[PDB]
Design a protein around this ligand. Structure first.
Ligand code: CLF
Ligand SMILES: [Mg+2]
Ligand SMILES: [Mg+2]
Lengths: 473, 112, 464
């Protein structure tokens, strides 16, 4: 049924956002409302639309200036917070740019301030010739026309290319709006503005993977082995110009259908490129994915050789962790997709029971997926808040929670260990080896002497301090 | 036939993603495309592999056909007509739950 | 030799040194017991700052958003403020203080915060008759100043609000102390100094418990310790000691103007002399003697630093960035130990104030090497100067500068805020005598490791 938590008695609309799956229910009658307005004052986990454009997607690129048109805080706030390495010395994580909007620009306009800042950026780093310009709350409110500024700069500096995104933080309800605006602008303006050499009979784009701790580089070892050219990664370890070539691919492979399904759908509509959704987390899921790709291409034997070698390498370790993790209870409190990518894969491959899940910004489509895959007796929460999190912990008593670091530091006080569900502990977590990495971190998190020590009150004469026995795969 | 159909439906719900595409018209296309190829594969017919979309439907259907043959001993015992009937039932169930009765408010939005 | 002040010469920023005003206001607020700040703006303005505090402290701090969305951008956001205050109050029965912090969005659209406060005060009075919640309007447009200015503004507004409600009472005998934006370890040190000097004092804000235990009973103790009652008693103090010109002195000035509590602003107590001068001021206002224990801690510091100064520090060139009170104070500490702070970077638009800071004169009359002080600086200004050939032996600054030092192969000591890329720094003092010693030691140890990694006379670390 839908659940009214005790902590929500004064915000009882929240009942329509929380589903407890019970036997025999028709789940079509219990789909949480999702992607609706936030309730003020709740300590919702949600971020802003600008975040979804710049931090999540655009900022992943290795060769592009990220010009945030606004006051300096939006820039500071999206710098030193992500874990998306590159093969060029991590230029993306080392720098952030701002137009340093001042009061006089609010009053008189910021377009000349933006134009100046853009030329300065290109002057300070003469090897960088690509730029994305984002609006933020106040530059949207004052109506600066960043597309027109961009056009002027490209006329004045014919060796650069500039893309613009209108994504002030108040647009939409969450990060999700930023994903949408960026995806549709990119396909409308920049796809099919360049071409590259095709070097394989088999070509794909990999859409919706942001190279968290090297996930994309790990998957790339698969595609290289298989002889598949990846025209563009959207956007892990990617380049601006690769993204201009997306129309050349034969196949679009989608992992993050939330952030990046938009561009896959438009590529299909406009260019006829088929969309294949996979799960690139999960051990048996990764095998299915590879088999689908290879069947599409007609390279089935090459796929089976890769799969066999990966299972010989990694399956014994995975099974060693399953033996120790079987029956453990997990919660997943992340953006959305990882709920449906992980609930059944950790169950199948590790024996882990996901007892509660919360999505900051997922849509009803994400809830359809996760409820389809998820267990009975589990809580499914759209746009969860802090008090709810406490009440859920008391209801389900998880052994481990996969969530962001701040919430991890909070639940630590309850002696519940965490794994960073967003930026990982010791990743990558995608692919065959990655799921073993995920399992190892779950195991170390749970089978941790400090947890046991923290429970002991040294004043209690009836209590001793225990000694715990760990293992390694 | 009801228990067999219940088996197929529980499989697709817990495993597959193609029935959960972003819009109604994509769900409809995928339910029909993939399940037609599943029927071919389960009954020994040559799959369609002409166009890029047919090739993708084959790839999705091959995972399901192989899984169904592994999981369900009945799928190797029933005849071609019974397979076809089941898959028609499965199409109608998947439309029902992913389209007709889904409360996903984005399903009919004309723009992606 | 010249100490020159110059502005950044670019309009735009690359690698900002500070966050915006609302972030500093949030920081102020999380030091108050039973306080949840409410940030009136878009959601990122809250969530990104809660993350920043988790990076620095490795703790969660409660801050709520009004969740400004598109409708409010067209018609105004007051209903979001008013809903947010009530939803906080209804769901957090022990909540006492809500600083209502504006952002760029809500400054631009002009929402009437004081009007919303009147509405909310009426609603709260009616719904919760036996409760008092203090709503403080905090005007923090992000398009001026920085998180330094925002911290100062929030402290002042909170103090105004709570003291307006309670007024002047019976003399407390206590000092008010505004240390500015310091670590829990700095607060621990000051508490110790006041205890050793038998001086009763409230430290605003008392953030010692941000370093909270993991307890057998599972309780959460990660809270500010400064209460309403402590803030209200400010009006009754003997004196205010303000340690940071840009981080609280304006509240000491407000309490002087309103309640005739005399405010004494001193140099922020980085290094030996500034600590000496602080303690002399305390003695002067309280009539209490400096204790022997502080003479001994000072002497232990001096002894430790004397093992370092002429051997490892002399003539070494240092760049320092961070809050203005920290940068100016650390430059003075560096010179006491024979380091040469040749580049000081201060990261906001308050240059017209900084040109009048007396510590600049104090540098001008002591330094024997040219010093460049870049105001309105970003961290690209440091990188660019290194790339143009500035030879540095040491950088002192916060963790968002780390890649400058890493790539230039220059040792870096992490000071100020945020220091996320090393463990435990929030617990170590940087001010006072113990702090000077710990800073000096961090410097030396950073140098020593550098010598080892680079094979630069690494054999010398034996009989120093
Ligand atoms: S919801 Fe998102 S992060 Fe917030 S402002 Fe808006 S785009 Fe940006 Fe920016 S400068 Fe500071 S952090 Fe805000 S108050 Fe403005
Ligand atoms: Mg089922
Ligand atoms: Mg000694």
């Amino acid at each position: 049924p839908m659940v009214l938590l005790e902590c929500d008695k004064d915000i009882p609309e929240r009942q329509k956002h929380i589903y407890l799956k019970a036997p025999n229910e028709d789940t079509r009658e219990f789909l949480p409302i999702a992607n609706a307005a936030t309730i003020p004052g709740t300590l919702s986990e949600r971020g802003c639309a600008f975040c979804g454009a710049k931090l999540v997607i655009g900022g992943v690129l290795k060769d592009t200036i990220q010009m945030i048109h606004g006051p300096l805080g939006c820039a500071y706030d999206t710098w030193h917070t992500k874990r998306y390495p590159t093969d060029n010395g991590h230029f993306n994580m080392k720098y952030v740019w701002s137009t340093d909007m001042k009061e006089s620009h609010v009053v008189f306009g910021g377009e000349k301030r933006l134009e100046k800042s853009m030329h300065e950026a290109f002057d300070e780093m003469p090897d960088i010739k690509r730029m994305i310009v984002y609006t933020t709350c106040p530059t949207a409110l004052i109506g600066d026309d960043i597309k027109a500024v961009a056009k002027k700069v490209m006329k004045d500096r014919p060796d650069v290319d500039v893309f613009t995104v209108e994504c002030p933080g108040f647009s939409g309800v969450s990060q999700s709006k930023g994903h949408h605006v960026l995806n549709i602008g990119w396909i409308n303006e920049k796809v099919e503005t360049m071409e590259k050499e095709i070097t394989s009979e088999y070509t794909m784009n990999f859409i919706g993977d942001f190279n968290i701790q090297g996930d994309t580089q790990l998957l790339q070892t698969y595609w290289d082995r298989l002889g598949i050219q990846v025209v563009a990664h959207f956007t892990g370890n990617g380049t601006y110009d690769d993204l201009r070539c997306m129309h050349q691919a034969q196949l679009n492979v989608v992992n993050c259908a939330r952030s990046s399904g938009y561009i896959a759908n438009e590529l299909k509509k406009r260019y006829g490129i088929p969309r294949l959704d996979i799960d690139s987390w999960g051990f048996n899921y990764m095998a299915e994915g590879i088999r689908k790709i290879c069947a599409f291409f007609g390279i089935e034997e090459k796929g089976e050789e890769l799969i066999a070698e990966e299972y010989a390498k990694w399956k014994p370790k995975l099974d060693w962790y399953k033996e120790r993790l079987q029956g453990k209870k997990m919660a997943i409190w992340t953006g959305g997709p990882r709920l449906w990518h992980w609930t059944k894969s950790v169950e199948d491959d590790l024996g882990v029971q996901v007892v509660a899940m919360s999505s900051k910004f997922g849509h009803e489509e994400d809830f359809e997926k996760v409820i389809a895959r998820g267990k009975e007796g589990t809580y499914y929460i759209d746009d969860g808040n802090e008090l709810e999190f406490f009440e859920i912990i008391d209801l389900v008593k998880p052994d481990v929670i996969f969530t962001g670091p701040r919430v991890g530091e909070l639940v630590k006080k309850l002696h519940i260990p965490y794994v960073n569900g967003h930026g990982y502990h010791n990743g990558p977590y995608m692919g065959f080896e990655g799921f073993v990495n995920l399992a190892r971190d779950m195991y170390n998190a749970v089978h941790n002497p400090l947890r046991h020590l923290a429970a002991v009150d040294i004043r209690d004469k009836s209590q001793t301090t225990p000694v715990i026995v760990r293992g390694a795969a | 036939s009801q228990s067999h159909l219940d088996d197929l439906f529980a499989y697709v719900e817990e495993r597959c993603l193609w029935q959960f595409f972003s819009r109604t018209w994509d769900r409809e296309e995928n339910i029909e495309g993939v399940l037609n190829q599943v029927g071919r594969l389960l009954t020994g017919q040559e799959p369609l592999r002409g166009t890029p979309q047919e090739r993708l439907f084959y790839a999705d259907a091959l995972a399901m056909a192989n899984d169904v043959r592994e999981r369900f001993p009945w799928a190797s015992q029933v005849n071609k007509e019974e397979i076809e009937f089941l898959l028609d039932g499965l199409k109608s169930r998947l439309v029902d739950v992913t389209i007709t009765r889904s409360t996903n408010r984005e399903l009919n939005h004309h723009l992606y | 030799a010249e100490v020159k002040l110059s502005p950044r010469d670019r309009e735009g920023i690359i690698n900002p040194m500070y966050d915006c005003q609302p972030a500093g206001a949030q920081y102020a607020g999380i030091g108050i017991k039973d306080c949840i700040p409410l940030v009136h703006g878009g959601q990122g303005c809250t969530m990104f700052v809660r993350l920043l505090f988790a990076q620095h402290f490795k703790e969660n701090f409660d801050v709520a958003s009004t969740s400004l969305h598109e409708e409010s951008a067209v018609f105004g956001g007051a209903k979001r403020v008013e809903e947010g205050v009530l939803v906080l109050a209804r769901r957090y029965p022990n909540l006492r203080v809500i600083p209502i912090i504006t952002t760029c969005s809500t400054e631009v659209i002009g929402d009437d915060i004081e009007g919303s406060i009147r509405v909310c005060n009426r609603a709260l009075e009616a719904e919760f008759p036996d409760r008092k919640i203090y709503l403080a309007p905090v005007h923090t447009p992000s398009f001026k100043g920085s998180h330094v200015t925002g911290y100062a503004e929030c402290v002042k507004s909170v103090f105004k609000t709570i003291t307006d409600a309670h007024g002047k009472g019976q003399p407390s005998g206590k000092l008010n102390v505004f240390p500015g934006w310091v670590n829990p370890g700095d607060v621990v040190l000051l508490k110790r100094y006041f205890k050793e000097m038998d001086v009763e004092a409230n430290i605003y804000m008392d953030t010692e418990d941000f370093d909270s235990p993991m307890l057998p009973n599972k309780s959460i103790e990660t809270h500010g310790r400064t209460t309403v009652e402590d803030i209200a008693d400010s009006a009754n103090a003997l004196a205010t000691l303000s340690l940071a010109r840009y981080e609280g002195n304006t509240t000491g000035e407000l309490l002087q103007k309103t309640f005739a509590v005399p405010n004494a602003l001193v140099n922020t107590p980085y290094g030996i002399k500034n600590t000496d001068d602080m303690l002399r001021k305390i003695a002067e206002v309280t009539g209490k003697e400096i204790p022997e224990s502080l003479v001994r801690e000072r002497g232990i510091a001096l002894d430790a630093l004397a093992d370092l100064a002429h051997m490892f520090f002399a003539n070494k060139k240092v760049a320092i960035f961070g809050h203005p009170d920290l940068v100016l104070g650390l430059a003075q500490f560096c010179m006491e130990v024979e380091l040469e702070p040749v580049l000081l970077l201060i990261g906001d638009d308050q240059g017209n104030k900084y040109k009048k800071d007396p510590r600049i004169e104090e540098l001008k009359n002591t330094a024997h090497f040219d010093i460049e002080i870049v105001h309105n600086a970003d961290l690209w200004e440091l990188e660019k100067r290194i790339n143009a050939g500035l030879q540095l032996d040491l950088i002192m600054g916060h963790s968002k500068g780390r890649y400058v030092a890493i790539e230039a192969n220059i040792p870096m000591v992490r000071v100020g805020f945020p220091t996320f890329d090393r463990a435990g720094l929030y617990r170590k003092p940087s001010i006072g005598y113990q702090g000077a010693m710990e800073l000096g030691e961090m410097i030396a140890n950073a140098m020593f490791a550098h010598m080892e990694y680079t094979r630069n006379k690494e054999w010398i670390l034996n009989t120093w």
